[PDB]
Amino acid sequence: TALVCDNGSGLVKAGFAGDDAPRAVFPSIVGRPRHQDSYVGDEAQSKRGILTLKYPIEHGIITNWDDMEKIWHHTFYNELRVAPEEHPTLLTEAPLNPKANREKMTQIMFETFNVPAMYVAIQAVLSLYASGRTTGIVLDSGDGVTHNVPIYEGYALPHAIMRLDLAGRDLTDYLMKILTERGYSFVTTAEREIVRDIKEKLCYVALDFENEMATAASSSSLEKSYELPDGQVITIGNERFRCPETLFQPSFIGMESAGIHETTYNSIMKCDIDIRKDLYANNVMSGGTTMYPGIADRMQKEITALAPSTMKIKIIAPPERKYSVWIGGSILASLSTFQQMWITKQEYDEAGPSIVH
Amino acid sequence: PKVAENLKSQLEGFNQDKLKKT
Numbered sequence: 001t002a003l004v005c006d007n008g009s010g011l012v013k014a015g016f017a018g019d020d021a022p023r024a025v026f027p028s029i030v031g032r033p034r035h036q037d038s039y040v041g042d043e044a045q046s047k048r049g050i051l052t053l054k055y056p057i058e059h060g061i062i063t064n065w066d067d068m069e070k071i072w073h074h075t076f077y078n079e080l081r082v083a084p085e086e087h088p089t090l091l092t093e094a095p096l097n098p099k100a101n102r103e104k105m106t107q108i109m110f111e112t113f114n115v116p117a118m119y120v121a122i123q124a125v126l127s128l129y130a131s132g133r134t135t136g137i138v139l140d141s142g143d144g145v146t147h148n149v150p151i152y153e154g155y156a157l158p159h160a161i162m163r164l165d166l167a168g169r170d171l172t173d174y175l176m177k178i179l180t181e182r183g184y185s186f187v188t189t190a191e192r193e194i195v196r197d198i199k200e201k202l203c204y205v206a207l208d209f210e211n212e213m214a215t216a217a218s219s220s221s222l223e224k225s226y227e228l229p230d231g232q233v234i235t236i237g238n239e240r241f242r243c244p245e246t247l248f249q250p251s252f253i254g255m256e257s258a259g260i261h262e263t264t265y266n267s268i269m270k271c272d273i274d275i276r277k278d279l280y281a282n283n284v285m286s287g288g289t290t291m292y293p294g295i296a297d298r299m300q301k302e303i304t305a306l307a308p309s310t311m312k313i314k315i316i317a318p319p320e321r322k323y324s325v326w327i328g329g330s331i332l333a334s335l336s337t338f339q340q341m342w343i344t345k346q347e348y349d350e351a352g353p354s355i356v357h
Numbered sequence: 358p359k360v361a362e363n364l365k366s367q368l369e370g371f372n373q374d375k376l377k378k379t
């Protein structure tokens with residue numbers, strides 16, 4: 001059976017092609033002994049007192065290869081419990097991944113794990129496939145990076161891809177900064193995890209930020225409470241929507257970048273004028289950071305304000321979009337016509353890593 | 358070319374209810 005591994009900056013999603021969900025979802029972290037020899041994922045966190053913990057993937061790109069090998073090793077033998085030499089393996093990569101990185105992923109899979117076949121797909125393209133489309137523009141926002149990726153007839157259009165180095169972890173850091181200013185103590189990575197949970201449980205995207213600020217200033221109607229591990233109950237009101245507003249207004253964390261609605265529009269305006277109607281009518285949201293309540297309605301509003309007045313705009317935000325990349329990979333690797341598209345180990349032995357492009 | 362055409366057709370027509378429950 002083919003395997004599918006979606007390597008994210010924050011979470012690894014892995015499982016078997018043809019399944020409706022990844023069987024393994026675990027933190028993309030590797031720890032090694034600080035004094036006087038590796039752990040991956042939840043066990044690394046459990047033993048963080050004796051380990052130095054690193055994320056091998058930064059903003060969607062693999063940066064620590066030795067640790068990335070540990071992530072894949074753990075994926076195969078500990079999480080999925082498979083022998084990789086027995087399974088074709090589909091891997092994912094970020095948009096705009098350097099060619100050298102794609103070659104190195106290929107070399108490690110064939111030479112270190114001895115997979116019989118592999119393939120590398122762009123994450124956003126798989127999310128589009130998971131919605132049953134081969135044309136559209138995807139907003140994929142995870143833990144480390146956000147991209148707008150316009151895709152036509154199955155191919156991402158690389159010249160029109162936009163990137164924002166703002167995503168879920170930066171939103172958690174911003175919420176942590178706001179809550180620290182209010183007088184709570186959140187400092188360590190363990191404590192930041194409490195903030196991440198607050199963000200997921202209570203934050204939302206306001207349809208109209210100014211209006212929502214006025215509501216929260218004049219009423220307690222938006223307030224929600226949350227019990228911290230130490231027993232304190234914190235109440236938040238405008239913090240709920242000021243946190244993800246940073247996606248529309250990156251200046252909130254001191255970035256000069258345009259917001260996700262403007263990067264969507266600019267992406268579409270980089271594409272051929274003859275495909276723009278298809279993009280506007282097929283805006284698919286993918287990734288954990290697109291889960292906030294309200295985000296699709298806000299996107300619909302903002303893109304409507306930027307686009308020509310008669311343009312048909314549709315935002316597609318599937319309930320399963322935390323795992324839409326992986327589900328697209330599960331579909332693609334299960335299809336009969338895809339089976340001749342795997343790069344085989346035999347082809348790699350003849351031609352080397354450059355075959356992957 | 359023919360492969361790309363058929364693959365697009367299978368993706369566009371795929372019913373996610375076919376996928377196995379985990």
Ligand SMILES: Nc1ncnc2c1ncn2[C@@H]1O[C@H](COP(=O)(O)OP(=O)(O)OP(=O)(O)O)[C@@H](O)[C@H]1O
Nearest residue numbers: 008009010011142143144145168200287288289291
């Ligand atoms: N319900 C939710 N609301 C808001 N944020 C969410 C929610 N659920 C998950 N997240 C955020 O999504 C991020 C993880 O999403 P995902 O697994 O898509 O990222 P990734 O693939 O690891 O990262 P990247 O694609 O950036 O490399 C985390 O920051 C998490 O806090």
Ligand SMILES: C/C1=C/C(=O)O[C@@H]2C[C@@H](CC[C@H](C)/C=C\C=C\CC1)O[C@@](O)([C@@H]1CSC(=O)N1)C2
Nearest residue numbers: 010011027028029045143168169172189192196
């Ligand atoms: C339920 C869960 C969700 C998740 O996405 O975690 C991922 C992975 C996690 C690894 C570091 C933490 C300490 C260790 C163990 C973690 C598991 C929590 C797993 O670092 C994130 O939390 C970062 C930091 S704060 C944030 O916003 N992103 C995203």
Ligand SMILES: [Mg+2]
Nearest residue numbers: 008009123142
């Ligand atoms: Mg991702």
